[model samples]
Target: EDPQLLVRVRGGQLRGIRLKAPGGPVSAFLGIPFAEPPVGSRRFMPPEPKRPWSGVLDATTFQNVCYQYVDTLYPGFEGTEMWNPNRELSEDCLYLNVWTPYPRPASPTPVLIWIYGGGFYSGAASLDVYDGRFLAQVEGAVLVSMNYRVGTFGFLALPGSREAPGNVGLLDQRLALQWVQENIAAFGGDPMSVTLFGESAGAASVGMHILSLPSRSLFHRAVLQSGTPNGPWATVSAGEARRRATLLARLVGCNDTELIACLRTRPAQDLVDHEWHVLPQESIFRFSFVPVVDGDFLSDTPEALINTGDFQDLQVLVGVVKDEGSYFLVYGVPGFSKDNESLISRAQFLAGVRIGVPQASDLAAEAVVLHYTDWLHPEDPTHLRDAMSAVVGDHNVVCPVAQLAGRLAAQGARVYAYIFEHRASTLTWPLWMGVPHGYEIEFIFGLPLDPSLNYTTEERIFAQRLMKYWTNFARTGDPNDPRDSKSPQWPPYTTAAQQYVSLNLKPLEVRRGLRAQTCAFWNRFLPKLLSAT
Candidate 1:
C-alpha cells in the first residue's frame, strides 16, 4: 500500500498519497475541489469558490471526469486507450490536481499548470497521459492539472438573458488559477512564478487568459503549442451562441419562458446526447460548443484586441508542428484516410478549402486553389494529397500562429518561437503524419507509464532537452540559462528578423521567416475577409 501524505490549503486539510520516482518519493494531491458544484440553480452560471471543509478531506482518488462523448476511435492503437480517462463522469467536475517534489521545500519552486485539449468539448485532468510525477521529479517544479465543464453545459449563451451568458468554462479556469495563487505557497510553490501551457484548444485557452483583463495577473509566462485565439473555431458571436442555445432548448422540451430552469432539471445525458446536432452540418469545424464574446470575460474579438495591443505583457513561447493537418485530414476531410490516399479532384480540393476557411471570399478561395495546384500533374493522387495537406495545415494552424508571433514581437514583448519536428518511432501510419498535432505532449510531459511504447535513445535525449528548456523558462523568463551547458542560446523574436528555433534530434538551429510567403498572404487577406462579415 502507498503511504499517506497531508497538506493544508485554503479549503481544508487534504490527505493525499506518495509515489516512488527516480529521484525519491513525490507527494501527489489529487481530486481537490477548487469550486462549488455547478448543479440545480447553479447550472450554467459562473463557478463559485468551493466551500471550506471541517475535517481532513481524502484526496487520493481522482474525481469524476466532466460529461463528454468520445468520438474518435483509433484502431490498432492501444495508446489511445492509455491516454483516455476511465473514471466516472459527472457535472461536478471543477477539480485540480498537484504533484510536488516536496510537501514543504526549503524554498518555493516555480509552478507549471497544464490544461488539456479536446476541441473544447471533451477532456479531463485525470488521464494517464497527464500524470505529472515524472516532470515534477526531473524538473524540480510543481506540476498542476485541472478539469473544467465542457459542451453545452459549459458554453451555452442566451443573449439579453440574465441567467446564461457565455464563457462559464473560462470562468471556471480563472477561478482555479485564483485558487493556486492563494494556496500554492503551502505546497512549496511560488505563486509569482506560475507558467501556463497547453496544446490545441487548451493552448487557445492560455491565449484567451492572456488577453482577458480578469485573468492577466494570474500567470507570468505562457507556452502556446499548436493553437491560437485567432483560429476560426475559437469564438462565436453572441447572436450565433444564442441561436445554438435556442435550438438546444427546443430539443430538450424547454420553453422560452422557463428555459434555464427546465434545462437545468434535465438529466446530464440528455444534453450530451443532443450536442452533436447543435451545429449545422456545413460548419467549418466539428465543434458545437465554444467560448463566445459575452461582453464580460471576452469584451471583443481576439484579433481586434491583439491588433490594438490590449493584452497582458507576459513573456511567451509559441509554435506549431511540421504537419498539423494530417491528423484532421484523416478524420475531418472526406477524401483521405489512414489506409489510402484516394484520388482528389479539383472540385473536392476547393470544397475542402471553403470548409476550412469559411470567412474567405470566392476570389480568395479560388486564389488558394490556384496557388496550391501542382501544375506538373494536377490530377496525380500523391501530388493532390501533398498539396491539400499543406493548404489545410497552413490555413488552420501555421499562419495564425505566425501572425500572433509577429504582432507580439511588434508590441515589444519577449517572444521565443519554434517548430517541433521530432517524429516518434512508434508511428506506423503514412509519412504525412509527420509530427502531427499533440505529438509534442509526450515529450513535454516526459512520456506515459505504458511499457509497450518505449522511447529510443535519441528520442530520450530530445525529451531531456525539451524538459530542460521548459523548466528553465519557468525558473527564469528566458529559456536558455548559462548554467546548463546542454542548452543552446535562444534569441527573442523580433519584427525585423522573424527568427525561430527548429527543435529536432539534430542540433538545435535558428531559422528566419517560417512560412513567410504563406503567412504574408494570410496577413494581407484575412482582415478583409473578417471585415466583410
Candidate 2:
C-alpha cells in the first residue's frame, strides 16, 4: 500500500496525496467539504457548515462538481474546452481543495484562495488548469480552491420568503472562507494572511465578498482580473432576480405559491435545462440569474453599496486584459457566432449598443458609437469588430475594473492595478482577438513550470514573471515596488496618479490613466446621460 498522508482539521481527519512539482513534492487534499451538500430541502438557502465526521475521510481524488450545463456549441475547441469542469456533475458539491508544500512549511504560509468563473454558471475547481501544485510548491504559498453551487441552484432568490434569500452563491464562498479561517493552519496556511484572487465572474465574486461586510475578515487581500462588482452586468435588481427565477420555475411548469419549495422539489437537471431559457429577453452583455440586491447581501445596487464606504480596507490588485471583449464578442454572442468569418456592419453594432445598455437613450447609444468608432476606418468590418469589442468590453469589464480599483484606493485601501498585455505565442484563436478575457490565467498559475506543456520559451519566462508578481502580492499587500524583484515594481493606484504597470514581456514601464475617457463615458458621463425619455 502507498504511504499514508493525513491532516486533521476541525471537520475530521483527511487523507491526501503527494504530487510532483518543479523542484519538490506538494501535498494535495482534494474535495474537503466545507458545507453540507446543498440539496433537496437546503437547495436555495445559504450554505450550512459541514458537520464533523467520525473517521478519516479519503480526499485523495477529485469529487462531484456543482450541477451546471456545459457549453458544447463550440465543442472540441480550446475556447470552450479550456474551462470545463473535469469532475462529474452533481448537486452535492460544496467541497474545497488544498495544495501545500510537502513536509509542510516550518511556519504557516500565506494562503491564496481561488474562485473559478463561469459567468456565475459553469466552472469547477476540478478543472485541470486550476491545479495549485506549482503555486504551492514553488511560491511557498498554501493554495486553496472551492466548489460553490451556481446557476439555478445557487443564486435563485424567491421574493417574500426567508427560505430562498438571494446570493447563496456568494454565501457558499463565505462558508469556504470561514472554513479557511478555522482550518487552513492545519495545511500550513496562515488564516489571517490570505489572498482572494479570481478572474471574470470569479473576480466579480471577490468584489461581492468585499461588499459583504460579514465576509470581510475572511481574507486580507484581493486580485480581481477582468471583472468586478462595478461591472454593469455583474448584479441585477431584486425585481430582475425574482423575475428571472420565476421564469425558470414556470419554464419547468412549477409556478407554485410556494415557488422556492417547488424549485427545491424539481429535478435539478430540469431546472438547469431551462436556466438559459429564463433569460429569453436579455442584454448581450449581462446574463440572467446573476447576483441581485437582496437588501441583505447587498443593501442596494453594487455601485451604491460600495460607494457608501461599505468595503473593508485590504490590499487590492485589480485589472483587465488589453482586448478584454474579443473572445466574448466572437464566442459569447449568438448573432456573432454564425460563421467563423462573420462580419458585422455599423448598424448591427449600434443595435448591439442599444440592446447591451437598455437604459441608454438612442442618443446615448450613438454617443457611445462615436466614442469607440475610429473615423479613419469607419466602414472597415475588421475595424468595426474592434470597435464593437470596445463598446461591449468597456461597458462590461475594463471600465468596471479600473473604477473598482480607483474606488477602493480612494476608500483607504492599498491598491496595485495592472493591465495584462501579453498575448500567447501558442494562441490557436484569431490573432485579431489579441489578449481576450481570462487569457492571463495560464501564466498566473505557472503553466510554464512544466516545459512538457504547450507553453513556449518566451511564454515560460513570462509565466515565471506572472507567478512571481502574483506570489509577491499574496505574501504582502503590495506586488512589491515597481523597481524591485525579477518582475519589477508595480506602482500603486491612486485617484491622483492612477499609475499602473502593463504586465507584458517588455522592459516593464509604468503608465497611467487606463481607458480614462472611455471609462468616464461609461462610469460617469453615460450614467448621467441616462435621463427622461
Candidate 3:
C-alpha cells in the first residue's frame, strides 16, 4: 500500500512518501519541477513550462536551493542553517513541494501556497521551518511551497534589450501558480480555491500578482504579512534596475553590446558574492536586486496603481508586527548598538533617518524630528532611539500597509487587517525590542518553541488560534465564519473606521487607528516632500 501511492501530474508520474502524524498519515510529494531550468540561453528569461517526463520520478528529497549568499555572517546573527537545512545550492532551482493528507477525501481541499521571503536575495522553500506536514495535517488543506529565482539571477533588468526584462522572479511565481491550477487536482487540491500568501518580499510578490494582468485568475485570495507592493524595499524604477544591472555587468568584466551573454557565462556564485556591495546605501532596506516596473508585470508604481483601482478585486489580509523597525535598527543602522547610549543622540538619529529617507527635504526631515520627538521628557536620552524606531516602522511598514488597507476597502474589496503583538518571554534581545519583525513566523508555521524561549499556556493557545484563523481565511474568504468559539469575530476593515484585529494572548480584541497621529503626519508630509524636488 505504501509503494502503490502514485499520482500523475502534467510532467509525469510521482511516487511520494507517507509520514505518520498525529492527525493521520500525510502524503508528501517533494522536489517536483514546475518550470524548465533557467540555464544557458534560458538565463534571465521568463520561465517556460516544464516538458513532460515518461517514467515515475522519485519525489522524496528536496531539490537544491536557489543560488544565494547565505545571511549568517551578520554581526549579531548565528547562521541560516536552522531555517534552511538543505545546504545544496544551484541555479536550476525552480521546484515546488506539496503535502496532502493520505486517504484522500472525496471532495477536493482548499490550497494554501506559501512564498518565503529573504529580502528578495535569500530564501528557500525546502527549509525545515517551512515544513508543510503539520499545517496540512491540522488545517486539512493541501500546502504547497515553491522556489523562485533570487538575486541577480532573478531580477536583473536591461532597458534596451528584450533579453533581460525585470521581474523574472515574479514571473517564475506566476508560472508555478499556473502549474498548480492545471495540475493540483490530481493531488486532491481544489484548482479554483487557491490562496496566495507570503511574508516580506513574498508578500510583496503576492501584491505584485494582485496588480499584474497575467496573474489575475491564478489565485482567489492573498495574505500580505508585513509587506505591500508600495513598501520602501519592494519595487525599484526601471532606470535604477538598469543601473544595478550595468554595475554588475561591469564588475564581471562584461561589455555593453554583449552584456547578457557575458553575464550568462559568468558563474552564479560570482554574481551572488558581489551583489552585497552593488546596492546604493541610501535606504535602511538597501536591496540590490528587486522587482522593477518593467511596463509588463508591473504597469506603473504600486502606489499609483492602487490609487486608481487597477488591482484585482481579491480578498486581502495585510498587517505588521509591533516593532517592524526593530530588526532594521539593529542590523541596517550603523550607529545603533545593543548597549551604547552615546551613539544614539538626536543628531545621529536624524542622520540615520536621512539615510533611510534620502528623498525627504531638509525641512521635511526636521519636521519629522519635531513631530516624533517626545516633548514631555525632552531631556531624557533613552527615548530618542525608541522614537527613531517608531519613525522607521511608520515610514517603512505601518503607513504603507494602513494606506493599502484603506485603498482596498475604499474600492469595496474584502480587506482584513491585524497587528501581531505577542512577544515570547525568553527572547534573546532586550525587552525594548518589542515584537520585532518576523517574530510571528514561528507561531504561524506551528513550529515548536525554541529551547531558549519560554512560552505560557495562554501563548500556546494563542498560537493555535492564529493557525486556525490563517487556515480559515485560506479555506474561505472570511476568517470569522468557521472560527473557534474562543476567538473573537474578526471584522472586515473599512475606510471610515480603520479597524483591525489586535492579536495578543489574553483575548483577541478589535482595535481602531494604529499609529493614527504618525500615519496622519506621513499621509500629509510625504506627498509634499516627494513633489518638492
Highest lDDT scorer: 2
Full-model lDDT for every candidate? 0.75, 0.81, 0.76
- Candidates' RMSD to native: 2.5, 2.1, 2.7
Specify the highest-TM-score model's number.
Answer: 2
Model 1, backbone clash pairs (residues 3+ apart or across chains), number: 0
Pitting candidate 1 against candidate 2, the one with the higher lDDT is 2
**What is candidate 1's CA lDDT for residue 525?**
65
Which portions of model 2 show Cα errors greater than 4 Å?
Answer: 1-4, 255-257, 280-282, 310-312, 332-342, 481-487
Candidate 3, residue 348: how far the Cα is off, in Å: 2.7
Give the TM-score of each candidate. Answer: 0.93, 0.95, 0.92
Q: Write the per-residue lDDT of candidate 2 for residues 501-524, one digit (tens) a residue.
A: 888888466889879888988888
For model 1, give the 10-residue run with minimal summed lDDT: 75-84
Candidate 3 weakest lDDT stretch, 10 residues = 76-85
